[PDB]
């Protein structure tokens, strides 16, 4: 398989699919009208539900997972008490860190606010 073309460069055969896979053309297509859906999913916090399901795919026992998460959150609160309880929750921080430890980027503790609040004092009125 070794062959040099007289100039020091080694010529080698590139590997190619050389076959038809009908699953390629039919599957690599994107829906164009899910901007509001994705934004609403991020706003309500379903990405954290997906993260929680993902973390349990590597756990033999879910009760052990819950106990370990609670212990880690307790350590977080004991070390830095003042940083939690408001916009940052310890359990959410633990979940985000465990997701981030896998190499998947997430906002810290899933802490988000509304950029459209019309100044201080105004509270969003939920539409039931």
């Amino acid at each position: 398989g070794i062959q040099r073309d007289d100039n020091g460069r080694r010529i080698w055969r590139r590997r190619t699919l050389t076959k038809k896979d009908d699953m390629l053309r039919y599957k690599l297509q994107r829906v164009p009208f899910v901007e509001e859906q994705v934004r609403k999913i991020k706003e309500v916090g379903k990405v954290m539900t997906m993260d929680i399901e993902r973390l349990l795919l590597s756990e033999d026992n879910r009760f052990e997972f819950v106990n370990s998460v609670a212990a880690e959150a307790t350590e977080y609160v004991e070390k830095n008490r003042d940083e939690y309880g408001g916009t940052k929750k310890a359990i959410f921080h633990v979940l985000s860190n465990r997701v981030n430890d896998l190499g998947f980027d997430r906002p810290e503790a899933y802490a988000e606010s509304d950029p459209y609040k019309p100044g201080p004092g105004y509270l969003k009125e939920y539409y039931t």
Binding site: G1, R15, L17, T18, M23, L24, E59, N100, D101, G103
Partner: protein, 416 residues
């Protein structure tokens, strides 16, 4: 301001995996003259835990039970197929590769099987480095009669199996699996060079399996790897995990340990390659001249128990000299130890001189040298892969002996 200021693999290779729930994170497939490899497309930052690199679903593998009886997961062989009769007649202990070769041929003949597509990225007969494809000329350059005898016996066994099970009267569905012997030989070579054995739990069943795993056999071997394989049973996924807390930079190759504690001869026999920094290589000394193990370890900063020798890499600072070769030397040099008894330097000088004499005798026993072997490799233009593999094997052995000599020299120098 922005205005003032190895080749990438075939995209279809990852695309066919990607459309079937194969996910590679932070790594890209690159192809070079040596072969396929996996490299970090960016800087893999070190986290608290192991990071997920690859995810290969179970349904894309070709796995067989490692112990009798033979059950395949997922079950691709239909009931009553003669390929099961061919598989079931093999020797349970040593004929594991034959069963995987039969499964590979059967899958290659299956129209809806994934490996009919992934099989186009396996190395061909002229690209595979396995010694089952080596001729008598290539084996003559191993400079090791034992390895040559082992390779000849393996080739004989493979050819005997093919002749026994692929005679004239076999049905057409079997004859088309391997029309001629070299096809089955290539199948066995691929099985030997790419098989992964593991203990996997599927549902409630825990068992050992011999597995042909796509996108994970592309990882290259290392005795100091940055990645390891972890089976996830809940969703039946094989994970490639980078070591926890080990930073990996852009372009750094992702490697796993194919088999720990195996010398270069076993690596050549199984995967058809060898490495110069094998920390388990052995050189047969007479044992009459011995040095102090503790001083040798302390000079080169080799810590841990005899089965976990490891270079600290901190006190050395920039000493590239200390590597797996020094560890192998410490594991193979004749040594003595008396708890806290210090060594007298004068005896160490004589011992290292005698050991260097033995090493130079061994180097002289070889017809050629290592530098001339490297020059032959550089000037090589019309040789098979196994030819260069044998040349590199003997060159690596010579390099290991030379490294032992230099290590003894610097050890006797630094003893004061």
């Amino acid at each position: 301001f922005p205005l003032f200021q190895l080749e990438s693999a075939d995209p279809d290779f990852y695309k066919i995996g990607y459309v079937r729930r194969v996910r590679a994170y932070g790594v890209e497939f690159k192809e070079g003259p040596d072969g396929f490899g996996i490299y970090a497309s960016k800087d893999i930052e070190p986290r608290r835990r192991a990071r997920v690199i690859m995810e290969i679903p179970h349904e894309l593998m070709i796995t067989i039970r490692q112990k009798h009886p033979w059950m395949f997961f997922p079950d691709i062989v239909p009931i009553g197929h003669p390929i099961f009769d061919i598989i079931n007649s093999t020797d349970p202990e040593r004929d594991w590769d034959l069963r995987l070769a039969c499964l590979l041929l059967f899958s290659f003949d299956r129209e809806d099987h994934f490996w009919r597509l992934y099989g186009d990225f396996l190395p061909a007969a002229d690209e595979c480095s396995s010694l089952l494809l080596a001729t008598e000329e290539d084996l003559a350059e191993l400079q090791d009669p034992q390895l040559v005898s082992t390779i000849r016996q393996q080739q004989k066994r493979v050819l005997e199996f093919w002749e026994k099970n692929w005679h004239s009267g076999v049905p057409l569905k079997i004859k088309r699996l391997a029309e001629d012997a070299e096809r089955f030989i290539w199948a066995v070579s691929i099985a030997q060079t790419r098989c992964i054995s593991m203990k996997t739990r599927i549902g409630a069943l825990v068992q050992d399996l011999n597995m042909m795993i796509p996108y994970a056999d592309m990882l290259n071997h290392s005795f100091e790897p940055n990645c390891f394989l972890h089976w996830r049973p809940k969703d039946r996924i094989l994970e490639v995990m980078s070591n926890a807390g080990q930073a990996i930079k852009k372009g750094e190759e992702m490697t796993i340990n194919y088999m720990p504690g195996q010398k270069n001869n076993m690596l050549m026999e199984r995967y058809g390659f060898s490495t110069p920094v094998n920390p388990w290589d052995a050189i047969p000394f007479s044992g009459d001249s011995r040095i102090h193990l503790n001083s040798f370890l302390s000079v080169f900063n080799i810590f841990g128990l005899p089965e976990e020798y490891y270079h600290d890499s901190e006190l050395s600072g920039d000493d590239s000299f200390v590597d797996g070769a020094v560890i192998a030397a410490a594991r193979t040099l004749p040594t003595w130890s008396d708890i806290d008894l210090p060594p007298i330097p004068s005896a160490e000088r004589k011992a290292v001189k005698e050991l260097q004499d033995e090493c130079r005798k061994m180097l002289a026993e070889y017809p050629t040298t290592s530098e001339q072997d490297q020059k032959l490799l550089d000037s090589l233009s019309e040789a098979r892969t196994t030819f260069a593999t044998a040349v590199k094997y003997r060159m690596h052995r010579k390099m290991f002996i030379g490294k032992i000599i230099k290590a003894l020299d610097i050890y006797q120098e630094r003893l004061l």
